[PDB]
RNA sequence: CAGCUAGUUGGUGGGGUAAUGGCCCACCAAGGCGACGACGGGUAGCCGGUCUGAGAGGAUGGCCGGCCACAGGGGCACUGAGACACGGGCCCCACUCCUACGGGAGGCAGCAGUUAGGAAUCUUCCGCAAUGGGCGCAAGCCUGACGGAGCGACGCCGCUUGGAGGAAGAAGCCCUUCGGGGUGUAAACUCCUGAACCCGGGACGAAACCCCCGAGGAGGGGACUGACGGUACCGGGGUAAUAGCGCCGGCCAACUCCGUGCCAGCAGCCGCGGUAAUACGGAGGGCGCGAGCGUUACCCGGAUUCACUGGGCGUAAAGGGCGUGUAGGCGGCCUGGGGCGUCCCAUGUGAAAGACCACGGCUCAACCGUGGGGGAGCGUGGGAUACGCUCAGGCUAGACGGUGGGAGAGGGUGGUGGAAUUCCCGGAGUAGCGGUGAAAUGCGCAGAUACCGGGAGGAACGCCGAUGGCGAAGGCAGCCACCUGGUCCACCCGUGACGCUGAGGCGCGAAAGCGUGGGGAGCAAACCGGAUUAGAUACCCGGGUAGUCCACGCCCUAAACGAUGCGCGCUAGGUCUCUGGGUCUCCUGGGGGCCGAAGCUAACGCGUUAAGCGCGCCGCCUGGGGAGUACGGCCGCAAGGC
RNA sequence: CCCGGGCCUUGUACACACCGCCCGUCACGCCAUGGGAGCGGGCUCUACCCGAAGUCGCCGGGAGCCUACGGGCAGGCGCCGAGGGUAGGGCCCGUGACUGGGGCGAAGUCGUAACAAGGUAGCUGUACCGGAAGGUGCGGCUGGA
RNA sequence: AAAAAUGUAAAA
RNA sequence: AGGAACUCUGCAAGUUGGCCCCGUAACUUCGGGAGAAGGGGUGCUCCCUGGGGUGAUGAGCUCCGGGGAGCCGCAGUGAACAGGCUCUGGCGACUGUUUACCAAAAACACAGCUCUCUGCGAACUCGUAAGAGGAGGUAUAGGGAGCGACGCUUGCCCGG
């Protein structure tokens, strides 16, 4: 443009909006579990994936993701939000943490514990 | 009626220069001789003299280059290789001092309209005092 | 969110306060504010500072420091130098508790501590010993301010889990061309040190108020007190003494084996997995980092992806459809005063904490003390005048005007000419015409087609006519006249910077469309029929309405296309065309088209008719889809448009 | 001309490359959203009615107390006044039978409109019409020859 | 100036 | 005391009622919706005061009004005259007309739309006729038919 124009009209501000609606972006959000079921991968992968429905304390209601082998949620479980989508699951937009709350870690995993919620074993 | 008149003016040089002229003409002006004083007190142009276009005071230009180049396209070398405007009609551009710029690290000029006469990038600096930023030449 | 305002704006007089003031009252006058964004809505305490960043900028205001505001919600005034008063008071509201039912108590957004909510945030500690505050002649009293401890890898910093040696190289584990390779000096083991732990000693922080001579002062000499603490620190005695997390396809540093078989599962981006995966899981090994590692979240960065620095708009997102002009923005050559912008000096200022540099303190650091530096901006005084600005005088190069000529489908009105189509009348004449790729529907023995004469009506204008001209765009063609805009060249005659651009606004704006009235030849959505086709709401054929035309009014869109906004300046030229000037195998001004110097460009391609070099102004773009939709607002009879 | 092949040229939205690609209705599932008889909820504006405490103003009289008799205090009325109440508008949020279109999907159905004269050049404003893409009309643009 | 429709879904 | 529980139905009755001022939505053909709604005032006494008519420019007379102080009752248009309101659907646009004497409507009439006849000695109507109306009008006129303001719009079928 001109001079006169930044004088007048101006840069318009960038601003961008959160990729995850989890209130305060809060690190986590707690929530009840209700619905616990697998859905179908998209378009390059098939590999029914373990997901939930949480119906947040924060009045909201989500899905999230299992990661691990296997789990033990059912329908009235309560559980944290880890928040990261899924770009495998269309709407999956928050993962669901590991070894808190009702909702248990993972059996037999040695790598990368940390992720997966397991507190470190004994080998002696 | 255009509006600055150092603007086409400062483009009278660098469009000549670029098809290699002797020299061009240009409306007689006070703040032109300025230009073209310093212009040629640093060395850019071979020097000026006020003529005339049918009862029209101009300004003979007489451009400076370099020696012929060997190689690919004879590119004899450019004396002014760069002049822009700085402070536009638009923009007034107004600097301080100890703000002066430093065209090229030195190798180039910054030709501005000082509040107690016109200076050099350098001479400016040394008499210490600022002014509008006319251009830079290198 | 586009208009807002009755104490509203101002005035006179008065009330009230420490004091000015619609702060408040009575009376009077209509003013006050706003696209430089009033009014509305949303959000939020502000700064010093902090975070990031090459800087400019962006983000931010936790701790400490300064100002502000509140003390359950909400109002009030009393006391006072000061309050609308956290730990005061009165009243209403919600809530809690007592109650002899008449009444009464109470406020942690003070330290600590509950409970709720949440992802998540500490002991109901010690002392007035130090510092500061209140009262007091003093002694001394109180002090959850503070000094200090306690819990939490929450952060930054210092340290420990050891050091030297030690096999051509244990054991196990992994790999293997079965030779060997790897873990790996790693360990085992030898030797030295010695955190932890033990014993003894053991602070600074403290001096002063208090006593004495002098004069109850100045000066000088004497005396009391330590929460932390029996802590840190000093000396001695002293045991090898916790290691974890992420990654290993590319980005990105780290490769192999088994298992699995589009499963399980990974995923930040691209992607991997469907029998041999360095990408899922385990292992061996390696890479990084270390009392940490890693995830999620949020901020700056990369992002020159809102571009001042520092973008761009022919086809990639983007020139407004075109014109007129309001604000605003910009300003030709010379001379003069002013000195507003701006430039320089001096000065007040910019407090402390911080950041930076320097020295120093705590064993170092973190932390901290001390000193030095210049700081943007603003206040005052002085100075300069170059360009911007401003008043003043002069010029003619921009723009305008005069005189004189020219070209043109520029526009509007009235009139008018031939050709041809259809129709009707009359003449003559007979079996077919028409139509397609083919054919049919259709038209004709009631006399068609073809041809001849007369008439009626509507619409469009052949040849001239083009690589043409004209206008702002849309757009404009037979012919004559009227009225009328724009444009060009010559004479350099007049004016004397009068200019460029243009948010909003005003006007124009193809075609289709709507409204009342008029006209209707041909053509022609829709619609009817024939044929093709699986189907054929279509391509072709036959018939046919609105519309196409006139008037007046509205609609306002388009591939409105050069897909290229407007204006002034500079930058080879060759070629032909429209038009104008001139003693003219040629020169000069305006317009149209091709090819190309330099140059720009992602390429194509542009290139004096720029997409070149440069200034001024508006318009506009910031991934695709969603969607030119939805809502709101405005315009319209509607369709629909902005 | 049919099938197959070669060199040059033109076009292209095709690139294990015309068995390529590709459009729209309809059908099933999913996600978000617009309108919707309404309902519910917050904030806000105006008019009026009631009106605590309290300052201020008046009275303090047929009534109380105080008094250096001039006055004071109590008390009463009034103004304003928190909030409460009634009626009516503005904005925002949630919700709602049904409905509109949109996005999404290894597979369906119906055609083939688009890219090659895509086998009627295509695109386009507007109009009309049709299961659907789309056809046709009036004009316009090449991004057609 | 050339009557004639259509090929779903797994690797460079 | 309650407040539509009555009943086919708030039928009837009751509520509201006049003026003054405040204030007033959806929607809309911008005219309206409007008296929308909802709400305040209304008497008497004293005092100040603005304007018009007549008339001399004022005295009296007379019309409409402004401000302040106060008095009495349960009640101030103190009696009589004197809308109850709102939301939503159907039909008909609307004012109008009708079954004198059980129906006032959604019926008819209407403006405006369309079709059709009629060229004047008009068509049509009454009359046997003369004649008259039409009309001392002339296709922007007249007769007949249907539809019924306005907006959007009106599809395919001549075989009978
Ligand atoms: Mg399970
Ligand atoms: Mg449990
Ligand atoms: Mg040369
Ligand atoms: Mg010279
Ligand atoms: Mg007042
Ligand atoms: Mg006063
Ligand atoms: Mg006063
Ligand atoms: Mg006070
Ligand atoms: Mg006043
Ligand atoms: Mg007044
Ligand atoms: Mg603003
Ligand atoms: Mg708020
Ligand atoms: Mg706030
Ligand atoms: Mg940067
Ligand atoms: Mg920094
Ligand atoms: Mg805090
Ligand atoms: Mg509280
Ligand atoms: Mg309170
Ligand atoms: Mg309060
Ligand atoms: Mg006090
Ligand atoms: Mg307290
Ligand atoms: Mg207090
Ligand atoms: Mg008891
Ligand atoms: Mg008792
Ligand atoms: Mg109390
Ligand atoms: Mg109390
Ligand atoms: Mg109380
Ligand atoms: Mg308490
Ligand atoms: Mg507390
Ligand atoms: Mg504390
Ligand atoms: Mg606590
Ligand atoms: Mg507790
Ligand atoms: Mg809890
Ligand atoms: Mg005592
Ligand atoms: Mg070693
Ligand atoms: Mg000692
Ligand atoms: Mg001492
Ligand atoms: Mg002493
Ligand atoms: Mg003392
Ligand atoms: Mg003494
Ligand atoms: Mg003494
Ligand atoms: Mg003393
Ligand atoms: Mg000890
Ligand atoms: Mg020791
Ligand atoms: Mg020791
Ligand atoms: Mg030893
Ligand atoms: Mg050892
Ligand atoms: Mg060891
Ligand atoms: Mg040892
Ligand atoms: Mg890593
Ligand atoms: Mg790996
Ligand atoms: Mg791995
Ligand atoms: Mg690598
Ligand atoms: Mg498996
Ligand atoms: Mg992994
Ligand atoms: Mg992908
Ligand atoms: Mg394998
Ligand atoms: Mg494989
Ligand atoms: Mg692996
Ligand atoms: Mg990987
Ligand atoms: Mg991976
Ligand atoms: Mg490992
Ligand atoms: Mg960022
Ligand atoms: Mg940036
Ligand atoms: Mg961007
Ligand atoms: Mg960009
Ligand atoms: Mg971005
Ligand atoms: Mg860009
Ligand atoms: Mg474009
Ligand atoms: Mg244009
Ligand atoms: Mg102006
Ligand atoms: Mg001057
Ligand atoms: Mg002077
Ligand atoms: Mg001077
Ligand atoms: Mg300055
Ligand atoms: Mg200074
Ligand atoms: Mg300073
Ligand atoms: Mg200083
Ligand atoms: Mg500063
Ligand atoms: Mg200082
Ligand atoms: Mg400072
Ligand atoms: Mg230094
Ligand atoms: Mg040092
Ligand atoms: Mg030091
Ligand atoms: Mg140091
Ligand atoms: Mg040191
Ligand atoms: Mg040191
Ligand atoms: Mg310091
Ligand atoms: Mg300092
Ligand atoms: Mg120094
Ligand atoms: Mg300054
Ligand atoms: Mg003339
Ligand atoms: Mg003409
Ligand atoms: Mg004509
Ligand atoms: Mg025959
Ligand atoms: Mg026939
Ligand atoms: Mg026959
Ligand atoms: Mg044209
Ligand atoms: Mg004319
Ligand atoms: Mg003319
Ligand atoms: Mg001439
Ligand atoms: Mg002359
Ligand atoms: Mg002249
Ligand atoms: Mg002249
Ligand atoms: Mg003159
Ligand atoms: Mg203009
Ligand atoms: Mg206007
Ligand atoms: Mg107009
Ligand atoms: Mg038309
Ligand atoms: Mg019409
Ligand atoms: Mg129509
Ligand atoms: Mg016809
Ligand atoms: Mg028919
Ligand atoms: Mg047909
Ligand atoms: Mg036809
Ligand atoms: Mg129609
Ligand atoms: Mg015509
Ligand atoms: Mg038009
Ligand atoms: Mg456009
Ligand atoms: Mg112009
Ligand atoms: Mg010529
Ligand atoms: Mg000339
Ligand atoms: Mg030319
Ligand atoms: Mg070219
Ligand atoms: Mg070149
Ligand atoms: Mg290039
Ligand atoms: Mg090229
Ligand atoms: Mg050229
Ligand atoms: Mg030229
Ligand atoms: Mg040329
Ligand atoms: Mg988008
Ligand atoms: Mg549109
Ligand atoms: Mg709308
Ligand atoms: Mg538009
Ligand atoms: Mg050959
Ligand atoms: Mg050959
Ligand atoms: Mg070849
Ligand atoms: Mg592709
Ligand atoms: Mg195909
Ligand atoms: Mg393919
Ligand atoms: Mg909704
Ligand atoms: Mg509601
Ligand atoms: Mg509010
Ligand atoms: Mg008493
Ligand atoms: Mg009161
Ligand atoms: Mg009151
Ligand atoms: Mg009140
Ligand atoms: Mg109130
Ligand atoms: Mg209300
Ligand atoms: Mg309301
Ligand atoms: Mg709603
Ligand atoms: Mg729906
Ligand atoms: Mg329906
Ligand atoms: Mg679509
Ligand atoms: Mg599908
Ligand atoms: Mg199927
Ligand atoms: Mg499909
Ligand atoms: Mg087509
Ligand atoms: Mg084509
Ligand atoms: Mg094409
Ligand atoms: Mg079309
Ligand atoms: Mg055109
Ligand atoms: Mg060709
Ligand atoms: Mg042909
Ligand atoms: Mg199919
Ligand atoms: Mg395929
Ligand atoms: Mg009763
Ligand atoms: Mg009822
Ligand atoms: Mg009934
Ligand atoms: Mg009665
Ligand atoms: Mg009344
Ligand atoms: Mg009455
Ligand atoms: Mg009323
Ligand atoms: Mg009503
Ligand atoms: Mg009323
Ligand atoms: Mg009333
Ligand atoms: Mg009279
Ligand atoms: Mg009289
Ligand atoms: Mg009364
Ligand atoms: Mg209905
Ligand atoms: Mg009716
Ligand atoms: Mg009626
Ligand atoms: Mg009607
Ligand atoms: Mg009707
Ligand atoms: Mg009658
Ligand atoms: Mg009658
Ligand atoms: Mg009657
Ligand atoms: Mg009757
Ligand atoms: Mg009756
Ligand atoms: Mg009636
Ligand atoms: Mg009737
Ligand atoms: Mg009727
Ligand atoms: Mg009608
Ligand atoms: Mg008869
Ligand atoms: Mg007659
Ligand atoms: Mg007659
Ligand atoms: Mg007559
Ligand atoms: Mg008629
Ligand atoms: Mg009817
Ligand atoms: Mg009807
Ligand atoms: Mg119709
Ligand atoms: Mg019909
Ligand atoms: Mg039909
Ligand atoms: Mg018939
Ligand atoms: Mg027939």
């Not at chain 1, 098939?46 to 924060?58: G, Q």
């Amino acid at each position: 443009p001109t001079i006169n124009q930044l004088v007048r009209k101006g840069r318009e501000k960038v601003r961008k909006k959160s990729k995850v609606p989890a209130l305060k972006g809060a690190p986590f959000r707690r929530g009840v579990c209700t619905v616990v079921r697998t859905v179908t991968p998209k378009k390059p992968n098939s590999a029914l994936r373990k997901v939930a429905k949480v119906r947040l304390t924060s009045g909201y209601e989500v899905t999230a993701y299992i990661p691990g082998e296997g789990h033990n949620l059912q329908e009235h479980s309560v559980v944290l939000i880890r928040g990261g989508r899924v770009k495998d699951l269309p709407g999956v937009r928050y993962h669901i943490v590991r070894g808190v709350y009702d909702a248990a870690g993972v059996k037999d995993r040695k790598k990368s514990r940390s992720k997966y919620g397991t507190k470190k074993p004994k080998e002696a | 009626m255009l509006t600055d008149p150092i603007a086409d003016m400062l483009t009278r040089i660098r469009n000549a220069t670029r098809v290699y002229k002797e020299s061009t003409d240009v409306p007689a002006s006070r703040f032109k001789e300025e230009i073209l004083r310093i212009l040629a007190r640093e060395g850019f142009i071979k020097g000026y003299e006020r003529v005339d276009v049918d009862g029209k005071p101009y300004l003979r230009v007489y451009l400076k280059y370099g020696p012929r180049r060997q190689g690919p396209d004879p590119r004899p070398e450019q004396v002014i290789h760069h002049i822009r405007r700085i402070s536009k009609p638009g923009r007034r551009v107004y600097v301080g001092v100890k703000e002066i710029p430093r065209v090229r690290r030195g190798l180039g000029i910054a030709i501005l309209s000082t509040s107690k006469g016109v200076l050099t990038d350098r001479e400016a600096r040394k008499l210490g005092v600022g002014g509008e930023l006319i251009c830079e030449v290198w």
